[PDB]
Amino acid sequence: KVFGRCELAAAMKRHGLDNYRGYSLGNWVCAAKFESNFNTQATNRNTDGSTDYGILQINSRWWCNDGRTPGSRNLCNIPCSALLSSDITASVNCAKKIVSDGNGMNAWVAWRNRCKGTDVQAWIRGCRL
Amino acid sequence: PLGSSDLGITAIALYDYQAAGDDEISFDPDDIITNIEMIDDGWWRGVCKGRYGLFPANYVELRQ
């Protein structure tokens, strides 16, 4: 599924992301835009043998188990395929672990690069929320 | 829903898989799996080459 901007904002707010760990809803929408272009099925392999999964491109070295990532942890305690669902529940629950683990939303390279320090409220303007 | 005309969620097989249960499917690398149902986080149902049933999700890559 490719989410609409406002559609995703409503779903993320429904799942408790607005101001989660102090990050306004626009941060989360923005991170999904530049991680996956809002596509729940995005899957990108890395040269270290890990892979990034789903709408927030969560990585298989620390966070989820894909069976093929050597010396990996599974700190969200889920198969990475869980992050490829059309509803965002599993990506949101995992995202809450990641953003709470000490580096806040800096865990998401596209958020650091494209969202941090921009007017992220733009990502929610015009949405009924 | 599942009854639509389109092929729904599709994937390509990355590795061989041999069905290991009465309710499973087999495929070869590069086979296409269509009409995927994400019934469980780890094992999914789908249709591959005229056969319907269960397969490990991490043996396929969603297109795209």
Binding site: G49, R68 | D40, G42, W43
Partner: peptide
């Protein structure tokens, strides 16, 4: 070069 994966855990419940 490339890893064939371990099978995911048997379906939950």
């Amino acid at each position: 070069s490339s890893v064939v994966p371990y099978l995911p855990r048997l379906p939950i419940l």
